[PDB]
Amino acid sequence: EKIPMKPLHGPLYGGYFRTWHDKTSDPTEKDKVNSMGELPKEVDLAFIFHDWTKDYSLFWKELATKHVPKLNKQGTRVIRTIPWRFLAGGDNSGIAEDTSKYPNTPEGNKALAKAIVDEYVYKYNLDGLDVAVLHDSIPKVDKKEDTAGVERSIQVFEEIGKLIGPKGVDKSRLFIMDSTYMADKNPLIERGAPYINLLLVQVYGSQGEKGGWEPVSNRPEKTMEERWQGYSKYIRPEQYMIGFSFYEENAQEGNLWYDINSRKDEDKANGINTDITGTRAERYARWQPKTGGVKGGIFSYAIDRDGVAHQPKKYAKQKEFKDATDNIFHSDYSVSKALKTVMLKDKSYDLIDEKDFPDKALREAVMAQVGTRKGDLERFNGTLRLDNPAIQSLEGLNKFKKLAQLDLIGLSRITKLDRSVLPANMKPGKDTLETVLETYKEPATIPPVSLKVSGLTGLKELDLSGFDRETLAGLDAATLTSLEKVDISGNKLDLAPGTENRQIFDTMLSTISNHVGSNEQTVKFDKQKPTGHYPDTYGKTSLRLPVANEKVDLQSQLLFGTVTNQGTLINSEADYKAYQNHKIAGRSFVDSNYHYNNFKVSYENYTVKVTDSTLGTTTDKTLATDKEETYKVDFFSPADKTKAVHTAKVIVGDEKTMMVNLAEGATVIGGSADPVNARKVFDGQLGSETDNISLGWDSKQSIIFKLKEDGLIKHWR
Amino acid sequence: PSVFLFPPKPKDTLMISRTPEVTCVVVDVSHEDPEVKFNWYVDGVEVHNAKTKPREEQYNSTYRVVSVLTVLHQDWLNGKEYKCKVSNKALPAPIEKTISKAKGQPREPQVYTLPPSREEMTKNQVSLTCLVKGFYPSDIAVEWRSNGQPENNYKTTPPVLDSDGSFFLYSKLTVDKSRWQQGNVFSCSVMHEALHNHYTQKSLSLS
Amino acid sequence: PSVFLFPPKPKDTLMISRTPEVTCVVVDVSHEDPEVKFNWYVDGVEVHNAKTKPREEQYNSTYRVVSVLTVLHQDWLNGKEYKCKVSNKALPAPIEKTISKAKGQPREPQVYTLPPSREEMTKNQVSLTCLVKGFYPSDIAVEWRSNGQPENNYKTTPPVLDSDGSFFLYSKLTVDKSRWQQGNVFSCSVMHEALHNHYTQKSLSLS
Ligand SMILES: *[C@@H]1O[C@H](CO[C@@H]2O[C@@H](C)[C@@H](O)[C@@H](O)[C@@H]2O)[C@@H](O[C@@H]2O[C@H](CO)[C@@H](O[C@@H]3O[C@H](CO[C@H]4O[C@H](CO)[C@@H](O)[C@H](O)[C@@H]4O[C@@H]4O[C@H](CO)[C@@H](O)[C@H](O)[C@H]4NC(C)=O)[C@@H](O)[C@H](O[C@H]4O[C@H](CO)[C@@H](O)[C@H](O)[C@@H]4O[C@@H]4O[C@H](CO)[C@@H](O)[C@H](O)[C@H]4NC(C)=O)[C@@H]3O)[C@H](O)[C@H]2NC(C)=O)[C@H](O)[C@H]1NC(C)=O
């Protein structure tokens, strides 16, 4: 019966064995000399990819009796691969064809879930189920995509997950899903994320490795990284598994990936290439995500074609070509075993030990939240909660290279805090990891870790020097009772009166004076370099000038301001010189090097639109004031040209009331011009670069129209 | 890499409310170097108002980079040479393709509506015909409409080359016999560059 | 080298007196090695009764080796797969092309003759129409004849796909108004596999 087997551990290697290449699949076909029992111990998962093989083939007897126990003995699980449409569909849906037996109801899908599992998993005493969510296997009705069928499969997938998998009664059997779709595109990932053990993305060829191309962007899309990136939200990284493909015999265009090494045109006789060097599979074996954690492993397709060389690219055009590779060979599964050992050689799959985290409560908290690998520390970019109070030493937090957030909650026993016992990304930095995939022809920026320190009663020292911290948010100073030393020098902190940082600093400083006084040795907070941002809104919304023969720079006059991350508006250089002289303990915090010019944000590249009283637009900062006029000056960011950041009201001389276009919204009621394009001369906008506002065909065209409102017309344009 | 420049729809070029497009498809694009830079000219006047269409969901095999260009009606009808210069890194030098309107003396389409056959009156449905002959060039569009409301169930034959040199075509409007016998109006709406406002109608009803 | 297998003329396959041909053109043939060996199969049954056509005038540049095969009518109408296996020395392995009759339930062509339009009666010439609809497959042939004598000046539109799934087409016979008003007979002679003797006529005259 169900043989006991050790759980899934380390890097895995999958392999879809094609049934019709088995020797017992069809005795008439004598060329098939392979067997599914010959799969070695290196192969963790052995998927049963069934087609062509007959319904009542001799393979099914050989599978359940001879193969499954042999594989389970050595340590290899057997999994059945059903398509998407077996869960819900009509066209070739196997079990779901009989809709009268298994209806589309709450109870009906629960009966179908059992029927699927029993027929596929438990029938031959297999060790898991696999669902292939592809466009090739998508639920169709009369060779047309079915909307209700896809919505049914989702619900069925949940019910099957209640039977087998992690959240099932029978957890011995695996529940797997394989997908060419991406996370955002595939709809089952959201619903059946907890219900699966492994996800098997199929990314054959350079289209998978390098990613497709976006012509409008002229940049790569759906890359290997971007593929995972979406799935990272839904599943853990150790569940993820990538797929390559071996050469299928007499393969045609649209199914030639050239993953494993091709045949040499010289070597006409030889059609075997067990060498794995310079292959896509070998690179896939070595590939690890840049964030989140290490992958679960890789898998092959048509593992029965292990070691078989790929048909050259030259002969890819000619359909009827009998190459040496198109012959069938008795594979000894050298590549599978080689690629497995390559993944074992990977050092990231080394477990976390006392070397990394001496403290047990920390080491257990990390294992629960983050992961159980050394590589996970280099990658993981999520929250890490250290709420457990019984924690002595935070040694080896520097192992975390890309941690997103760190919560220190109720950790009284902690005393000192410095770069040693904190993440590496306390300060900013670029990506240190290196990819092992091919590409076309810049390392990613690592966000500084968010630090919430609250409830640490027995915390004494606190060093955050040279970390370039933007704020002091998170530091609950009221709970830090036993505080004595502090160091926040060489950061980008706005420590001005009234700021949240100063409130935290003052609450901290009052604790320092009590215990060991306040001085240069205990307290440090010098040489700050606060980040200068753009303000949300602006105050200077008007400007009355004379009718002088002079020119004025509207930008400098109207558009100015450099807010901080806390919220201190520095408008002029004088305001900064005042800011520089925020003396705390008889010395300023701001660096002397960090002048106003280094802090100031540039308002170059900002566009401007000067609408005069007769709605006459002009895009020039240098406004002449020689003529009497009233203006509405709108400013726009280099990013967003449509939405104005600020609007002003310049009035050279006596104010004139701003006119309004009475034609805008005019009811066209005649003229030779086309009524459609006639309305678009009163639309309000000019039009898109590639619009069409041709009034008519003839050179002369007329428009008869009525105004929207009554008024006194003083001007037209 | 192969280039395939295509002309605008006749209906689009003969109606100013609609927007005509000169599509430039590129098939068998290099998988290694998939960068494609399109350059668009109109009698030498290079325009930069094109729009590369998003990569459609072809399964595998060959990249197919489309590039559309919105064009002025007058420019097409005047017969300006729209040139699509494709530029690929794999390609040693750019592939150019040029297209223009059919060059020849335009001719007015004589539009004629024919009623259902005397034999077809026995059937529960009937076929209203619209002959359109003696026109040039082949760029033409035809539409039916019953009592103002645009018709659904009709089909138009391709422009066929006539003996004299002009083209011709028919358009079959399949309707129920009820609406014919009751006495509705059905109007064949031909559209050709050699018409008043590129438009003309011929009504058809029972007698 | 590119191969282009072509079906027989509809008129040839629907008349036993005429002889149908399955042409297999080969273009862009190697200038270096111009030897082309055609192999002809009919559901595997290799036939050896083909005839390589002489090199037509041609305007240099690229060799175009045509190969004709005379076929039995019944074999075509039954829908046997005619396969043209081209073999060139430059070509690494032979290019095969296969063709057969359209697979689906045949349907009878409803033939209807329509007289000239009421408006066209003002013109010195008139257009006699012949609607042919509701037929499948597209393999069809149409001819006019006035008082027995085969007509010269007429044109037939390609088979156009109808809404239901069948095809249809029109045929325009341009004649003088004199012969129409005088009261001659003109007969639209449709020919389709789903007819009696693959043949049917509909006469047309003044009333
Ligand atoms: C585009 O590429 C993708 C793959 O790439 C992926 O997507 C792209 C976009 C990128 O993102 C990549 O990075 C990414 O990796 C293609 O998807 C693959 O397509 C190939 C075929 O081109 C498939 O291989 C074939 O698989 C069929 C199996 O078909 C079953 O399984 C399908 C998947 O579940 C399912 O959709 C089918 O409906 C079918 O399902 C079965 O249905 C029956 C009946 O209901 C049921 O009983 C079964 O239980 C059920 N089984 C399953 C598992 O669902 C297989 O049959 C094919 O074998 C033929 O072709 C081989 C060569 O490719 C050849 O070696 C074999 O010998 C065999 O050839 C036939 O042999 C018989 C004799 O036995 C002979 O009589 C025939 O004449 C002969 N036929 C031919 C044509 O030679 C083959 O193995 C992949 O499985 C599939 N990928 C995956 C992961 O499944 C996509 O199709 C490509 N599209 C285009 C347009 O190019």
Numbering used by the authors:
A (entry chain C): 102 to 542, 548 to 823
B (entry chain A), C (entry chain B): 238 to 444
Describing publication, verbatim:
The Streptococcus pyogenes bacterium secretes the protease IdeS and the glycosidase EndoS, which specifically catalyse cleavage and deglycosylation of human IgG, respectively. We present crystal structures of both enzymes in complex with their IgG1 Fc substrate, which was achieved using Fc engineering to disfavour preferential Fc crystallisation. We show that mutation of IgG Fc residue E382, which consistently forms salt bridge interactions in Fc crystal structures, can be used as a strategy to discourage Fc self-crystallisation and thus promote crystallisation of protein complexes. We present crystal structures of IdeS/IgG1 and EndoS/IgG1 complexes, to a resolution of 2.34 Å and 3.45 Å, respectively, and map the extensive interfaces that are formed in these complexes.
Here, we present the structure of truncated EndoS (residues 98-995 ) in complex with its IgG1 Fc substrate (E382R variant). A catalytically inactive version of EndoS was generated by the inclusion of D233A/E235L substitutions. The complex, containing two copies of EndoS and one IgG1 Fc molecule, crystallised in space group P212121 and was refined to a resolution of 3.45 Å. The glycosidase domain of EndoS is observed forming contacts with the glycan-containing C′E loop, while the CBM forms additional interactions at the Fc Cγ2-Cγ3 interface. We note that residue W803 within the CBM, whose substitution to an alanine has previously been shown to abolish hydrolytic activity against all human IgG subclasses, appears to act as a hydrophobic “plug”; it binds within a cavity at the Cγ2-Cγ3 interface containing Fc residues I253, H310, L314 and H435, and has the highest solvation energy (of 2.06 kcal/M) of all EndoS residues calculated by PDBePISA, indicating that strong hydrophobic interactions are present here. Therefore, the CBM appears to drive additional specificity of EndoS for the Fc peptide surface. A structural overlay with full-length EndoS in complex with its G2 oligosaccharide substrate (PDB 6EN333) shows that the overall morphology and domain organisation of EndoS is approximately maintained, apart from a slight shift of the CBM and C-3HB, likely due to a pinching of the CBM around the Fc as it binds.
